Write a protein that binds this ligand. Structure first.
Ligand SMILES: *[C@@H]1O[C@H](CO)[C@@H](O[C@@H]2O[C@H](CO)[C@@H](O[C@@H]3O[C@H](CO)[C@@H](O)[C@H](O)[C@@H]3O)[C@H](O)[C@H]2NC(C)=O)[C@H](O)[C@H]1NC(C)=O
Ligand SMILES: *[C@@H]1O[C@H](CO)[C@@H](O[C@@H]2O[C@H](CO)[C@@H](O[C@@H]3O[C@H](CO)[C@@H](O)[C@H](O)[C@@H]3O)[C@H](O)[C@H]2NC(C)=O)[C@H](O)[C@H]1NC(C)=O
Ligand SMILES: *[C@@H]1O[C@H](CO)[C@@H](O[C@@H]2O[C@H](CO)[C@@H](O)[C@H](O)[C@H]2NC(C)=O)[C@H](O)[C@H]1NC(C)=O
Ligand SMILES: *[C@@H]1O[C@H](CO)[C@@H](O[C@@H]2O[C@H](CO)[C@@H](O)[C@H](O)[C@H]2NC(C)=O)[C@H](O)[C@H]1NC(C)=O
Ligand SMILES: *[C@@H]1O[C@H](CO)[C@@H](O)[C@H](O)[C@H]1NC(C)=O
Ligand SMILES: [Zn+2]
Lengths: 596, 195
C-alpha cells in the first residue's frame, strides 16, 4: 500500500476519535463558561488536558507519513495540521519555563492593580477603573496618570519575562524550521502546493506594507481632523503639527479612537442612529433579537438555526443565582451541536453583536461536512470578517427600516452620513496603523533587528513614524509598554485584525455588487439577496480545504488582499476630510514631544 | 389467534450495534402490518418492491426482522444501492431488495449524558459486505505493509469505533433505531399471513 492511503486511513481513525474527544472538551468548557463553579473548572481542565495529550499523541503518529510523498492536497493539509510539533521540540525544562512565563504574564496582566491615587488603599485594575478613566476623562493630568501608572507598574514587571519569552519562542520556531517567531506566526497565511494560489510567509509583509501605503492618506486626513478637534479639547497641550499624545486617544493604548467621537463629531446637532429606545418600546427580548438575526440570514438563502441551537444555549443573563462569563462567543462543539453564549440586553449594540456571532455560527454550520482539522476559516482573519460584514449589513438604516425599528420618514442627509462614516473610521481606520506598527515591532524583535537596549526606543520611534502618536512621558528600557496590551502579553498574533479589516470590506463590496446595490457602499443592505448569499456560501462551505487566496477569489474575484474596498467604503468621508483640512496641516512631525 | 412477536423486535429494551445487527426469524404467526405508528410519528418508512398498507394480505414462508442502531446521517445508507461506512462494512441490502425499512429516533433511549459508547460500528474492512452479510471480527486491521500480529499500533488500528451518543448531539449524530423487514418465498407453504 501507498503512504497516501495509509495517511487517509489514519485520518479517518483520527477524525472520529478527535471529534468525540473535542466534543467532551467543548462540553466541559461550556459548562464552565455558563456556570462558573469549582467542579466545573476541574472538569474543564481535565477534559482539556485529555485533549492536549491526545493531540500530542496524534502529532507523533502523523509525523510518520512523509509529507513529500502525499499527492492529495486535502490529506496534505490535515497531515500538516497534525505535524505542528510546536514547542514539543524544546527540552522539558525550556518548555516548562516557557509555560511558566506565559502564565505569569497572563496573570500579571489580568491581575495588575495600581494604587495610591491619593491613598494607598484605593486601588484600581485595568477593567473597569483604568478603562473608565481612559474612556471618559477629559482631564489631561488624570489621563496621563492612568496611562503612565498602568505602564510603569505592570509593564516593568512584564519586561524581563517578555525578553525570556522572545528568546524561548524563537528557539521553538527555529527548531521547527522557521526563521523566527514572527515567521511562525506569518506561517498561518502560507500556501504551498497550489499553482497560481501560492503564498510565502514574507509575501504577507510585502502585501501588508503596500496596502498600508495606500491607506496612508485617508488616515493622515483623519489624524489631522482629530488633532484639530483635540486641540479644541486640549488647547495648551497639543501641537498643531506634532503626533497625538498617546493618553488622549480614547482607550489605554490608542487601538481604537472610538471614544473620541464625542470630541470629534462633525455635526453633533444631528441625532445618532441608536434604535435602542425603539427596541425597548416594541417590547423586544433576546428571543426576538436572535429570531430577527435568523430571519436576516434566511432571507439570503441560508438555513435557520438548529433546534439543538435553540434549546442548548444561554441567550439571556441567567441571573444572580448562576454567574457566567458574558463575553459573546459562538460555540461549535461538533457532532451538530451549535450554541451561542451571550448575556443579551435589549440594546442596538447587542443586536449587532448577535448578528456578528450568528454569522460566526453560520460559518461553522456551512463547513461542517469538512474533515475535522479542516473545519476552520481559510486563515485567522476570515471568521471575524464574516461576523463583521453581518453586523455592517444589520447596522444600515435601510435594514433598520425594513425590520421596523427605525421610522420610515427618517431622512438620510449627507450630515448623518458623514457622522456615521466618521464614527466608523475612528474605530476601523484608526486601528490600522496601530495594528500594523505593533505587529511590525514584534516581527522585528523576533527577527533580532531591534536590540534590547533600545526596544522601547524603536517602539516609540515607530509609534511616532507610523501611527502619528507620541508618548506623553519618556520611557527607558525598564518599561515594556507593548506588553501592556492583552494580545502582546498573552501570546496572541495581532495582524489578524488588519487582514480581517481589509477582507471584510472586500466581502462587503463583492456581495453588494452581487446584490445589485445602488449608491455608496456604506448604505448597502444585502438582505433578500440570494445571489450574495450563494456567493458567500461558496466560500463558507470550503472551510480550510482550499487556500485562503482561492477562498477570497471565490467571493471577490481576487487572489490577494485589497485596500480599494475599504477606500470606496470611506470615499465620501475622505472627500469631506480633504475639504475640512484645507487650512489645516495634514501629516505630522516625528520630533515634537509634550516633554521637551 | 397466534400473532407475530413484533413487540420483541420493536420495543426491545436494548438494540444491537450495527456491526453485529440482530436478526429475528418470524414464522408461524399472523403479522399485523396495518399498525402505521407504534412508538412515535412515522419517522422513516420506506418499503421497496412492496406497498406499506393495503398489502398485509400477502403471505411469505418467513419474515426476517434485522434490528440495529446508527446515527441519523447514516439512515440514508439503509437502502438498495447505497454506499458509505454502514452500507459497505456494516449492513448491505441487495439492489433488488423486496422488503421494508423502518427507522425512528431514540435520543431519549440511547443517549447517555456522559456518552453512550456501548454502540459500536465497523470503520475498517478489507472488502465491502455482501448483501445481508454479517461480520464480527475484533481483529486488528492492517493498513500498513508490516504485520500487525494481533496488536494495535503504527498503521494497525482496531476496526471498531464507538458512537458515543450524547443527548445534546445534533439530529444527524443522534441514536436511531432501525428495523429491516425481509420477506422470503420458498417452496414450502407460507407461514406468515395477515387476513
Ligand atoms: C483526496 O482524498 C479524498 C479522500 O480523503 C478524496 O475524497 C473522496 O472522494 C470520493 C470520490 O468522489 C468520495 O466518494 C463519493 O461519495 C459520495 C457520497 O456523498 C458519492 O455520491 C460519490 O459518488 C463518491 O462515491 C469520498 O466521499 C471522498 N471522501 C471524503 C472524505 O469526502 C478525494 O477525491 C481525493 N482527491 C483527488 C484529487 O482524488
Ligand atoms: C425583503 O425584506 C423585507 C424586510 O427586510 C421584507 O418586507 C417586510 O415584510 C414584513 C412582513 O411582511 C413587514 O412587516 C410588517 O409590515 C406591515 C406593513 O408595513 C406592518 O403593518 C407590520 O406591522 C409589519 O411591520 C415589513 O414592513 C416589510 N418591510 C419591507 C421594507 O418591505 C420583504 O418581504 C423581503 N422581500 C422578499 C422577496 O423576501
Ligand atoms: C451549575 O453547576 C453545578 C455543579 O457545581 C450543577 O449541579 C449542582 O451541584 C451538584 C453537582 O452534582 C448537585 O448535587 C447540585 O444539586 C446542583 N445544583 C446546585 C444548586 O448545587 C448545576 O446543576 C449547574 N446549574 C445548571 C443550571 O445546570
Ligand atoms: C427555518 O425555520 C423557520 C422558523 O424558525 C421556518 O419558517 C417558519 O415556519 C414555517 C415554515 O415551515 C412558515 O410557514 C412560517 O411562516 C415561518 N415563520 C416565520 C416567522 O417566518 C423556515 O421555513 C425554516 N427554513 C426552511 C428553509 O424551511
Ligand atoms: C450637504 O448638502 C449640501 C447640498 O448642496 C452639500 O453641498 C454639502 O456637502 C453639505 N452641506 C453642508 C452645509 O455641509
Ligand atoms: Zn465574533
Amino acid at each position: 500500500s501507498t503512504i497516501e492511503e495509509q495517511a487517509k486511513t489514519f485520518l479517518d481513525k483520527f477524525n472520529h476519535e478527535a471529534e468525540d474527544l473535542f466534543y467532551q472538551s467543548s462540553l466541559a468548557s461550556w459548562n464552565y463558561n455558563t456556570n462558573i463553579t469549582e467542579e466545573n473548572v476541574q472538569n474543564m481542565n481535565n477534559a482539556g488536558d485529555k485533549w492536549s495529550a491526545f493531540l500530542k499523541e496524534q502529532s507523533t503518529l502523523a509525523q510518520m507519513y512523509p509529507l513529500q510523498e502525499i499527492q492529495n492536497l486535502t490529506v496534505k493539509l490535515q497531515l500538516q495540521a497534525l505535524q505542528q510539533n510546536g514547542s514539543s521540540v524544546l527540552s522539558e525544562d525550556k518548555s516548562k519555563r516557557l509555560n511558566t512565563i506565559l502564565n505569569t504574564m497572563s496573570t500579571i496582566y489580568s491581575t495588575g492593580k495600581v494604587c495610591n491615587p491619593d491613598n494607598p488603599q484605593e486601588c484600581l485594575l485595568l477593567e473597569p477603573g483604568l478603562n473608565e478613566i481612559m474612556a471618559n476623562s477629559l482631564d489631561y493630568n488624570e489621563r496621563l496618570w492612568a496611562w503612565e501608572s498602568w505602564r510603569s507598574e505592570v509593564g516593568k514587571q512584564l519586561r524581563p519575562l517578555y525578553e525570556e519569552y522572545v528568546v524561548l519562542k524563537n528557539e521553538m520556531a527555529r527548531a521547527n524550521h522557521y526563521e523566527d517567531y514572527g515567521d511562525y506566526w506569518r506561517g498561518d497565511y502560507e500556501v504551498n502546493g497550489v499553482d497560481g494560489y501560492d503564498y510565502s510567509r514574507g509575501q504577507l509583509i510585502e502585501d501588508v506594507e503596500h496596502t498600508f501605503e495606500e491607506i496612508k492618506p485617508l488616515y493622515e486626513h483623519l489624524h489631522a481632523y482629530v488633532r484639530a478637534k483635540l486641540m479644541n479639547a486640549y488647547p495648551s497641550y497639543i501641537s498643531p503639527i506634532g503626533c497625538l499624545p498617546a493618553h488622549l486617544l480614547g482607550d489605554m493604548w490608542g487601538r481604537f479612537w472610538t471614544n473620541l467621537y464625542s470630541l470629534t463629531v462633525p455635526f453633533g446637532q444631528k441625532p445618532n442612529i441608536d434604535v435602542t429606545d425603539a427596541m425597548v418600546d416594541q417590547a423586544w427580548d433576546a428571543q426576538r433579537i436572535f429570531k430577527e438575526a435568523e430571519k436576516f440570514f434566511v432571507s439570503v438563502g441560508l438555513p435557520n438555526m438548529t433546534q439543538g441551537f435553540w434549546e442548548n444555549s444561554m441567550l439571556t443573563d441567567p441571573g444572580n443565582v448562576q454567574k457566567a462569563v458574558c463575553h459573546p462567543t459562538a460555540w461549535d462543539l461538533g457532532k451538530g451541536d451549535f450554541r451561542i453564549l451571550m448575556c443579551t440586553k435589549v440594546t442596538m449594540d447587542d443586536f449587532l453583536t448577535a448578528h456578528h456571532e450568528m454569522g460566526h455560527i453560520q460559518y461553522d454550520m456551512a463547513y461542517a461536512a469538512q474533515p475535522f482539522l479542516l473545519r476552520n476559516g481559510a486563515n485567522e482573519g476570515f471568521h471575524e470578517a464574516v461576523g463583521e460584514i453581518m453586523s455592517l449589513s444589520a447596522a444600515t438604516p435601510k435594514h433598520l427600516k425594513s425590520i421596523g425599528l427605525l421610522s420610515p420618514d427618517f431622512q438620510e442627509d449627507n450630515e448623518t452620513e458623514i457622522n456615521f462614516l466618521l464614527k466608523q473610521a475612528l474605530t476601523i481606520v484608526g486601528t490600522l496603523p496601530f495594528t500594523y506598527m505593533l505587529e511590525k515591532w514584534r516581527w522585528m524583535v523576533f527577527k533580532g533587528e531591534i536590540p534590547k537596549d533600545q526596544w522601547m526606543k524603536k517602539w516609540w520611534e515607530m509609534k511616532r513614524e507610523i501611527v502619528g502618536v507620541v508618548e506623553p512621558v519618556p520611557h527607558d528600557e525598564t518599561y515594556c509598554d507593548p506588553a501592556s496590551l492583552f494580545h502582546v502579553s498573552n501570546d496572541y498574533s495581532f495582524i489578524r485584525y488588519y487582514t480581517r479589516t481589509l477582507y471584510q470590506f472586500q466581502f462587503q463590496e463583492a456581495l453588494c455588487q452581487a446584490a445589485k446595490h445602488e449608491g455608496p457602499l456604506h448604505k448597502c443592505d444585502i438582505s433578500n439577496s440570494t445571489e450574495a448569499g450563494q456567493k458567500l456560501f461558496n466560500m463558507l462551505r470550503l472551510g480550510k480545504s482550499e487556500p485562503w487566496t482561492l477562498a477570497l477569489e471565490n467571493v471577490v474575484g481576487a487572489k490577494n488582499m485589497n485596500v480599494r474596498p475599504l477606500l470606496n467604503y470611506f470615499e465620501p468621508l475622505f472627500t469631506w476630510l480633504k475639504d475640512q483640512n484645507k487650512n489645516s496641516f495634514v501629516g505630522w512631525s516625528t520630533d515634537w514631544s509634550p516633554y521637551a | 389467534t397466534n400473532l407475530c412477536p413484533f413487540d420483541e423486535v420493536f420495543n426491545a429494551t436494548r438494540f444491537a450495534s450495527v456491526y453485529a445487527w440482530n436478526r429475528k426469524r418470524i414464522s408461524n404467526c399472523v403479522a399485523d402490518y396495518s399498525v402505521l405508528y407504534n412508538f412515535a410519528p412515522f419517522f422513516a418508512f420506506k418499503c421497496y418492491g412492496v406497498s406499506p398498507t393495503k398489502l398485509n394480505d400477502l403471505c411469505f414462508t418467513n419474515v426476517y426482522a434485522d434490528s440495529f442502531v446508527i446515527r441519523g446521517n447514516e439512515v440514508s445508507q439503509i437502502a438498495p444501492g447505497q454506499t458509505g461506512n454502514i452500507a459497505d462494512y456494516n449492513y448491505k441490502l441487495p439492489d433488488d431488495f423486496t422488503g421494508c425499512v423502518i427507522a425512528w429516533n431514540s435520543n431519549k433511549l440511547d443517549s447517555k449524558v456522559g456518552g453512550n459508547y456501548n454502540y459500536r460500528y465497523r470503520l475498517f474492512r478489507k472488502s465491502n459486505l455482501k448483501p445481508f452479510e454479517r461480520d464480527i471480527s475484533t481483529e486488528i486491521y492492517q493498513a500498513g505493509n508490516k504485520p500487525c500480529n494481533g496488536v494495535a499500533g503504527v498503521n494497525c488500528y482496531f476496526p471498531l469505533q464507538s458512537y458515543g451518543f450524547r443527548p445534546t448531539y445534533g439530529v444527524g449524530h443522534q441514536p436511531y433505531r432501525v428495523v429491516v423487514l425481509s420477506f422470503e418465498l420458498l417452496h414450502a407453504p407460507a407461514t406468515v399471513c395477515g387476513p
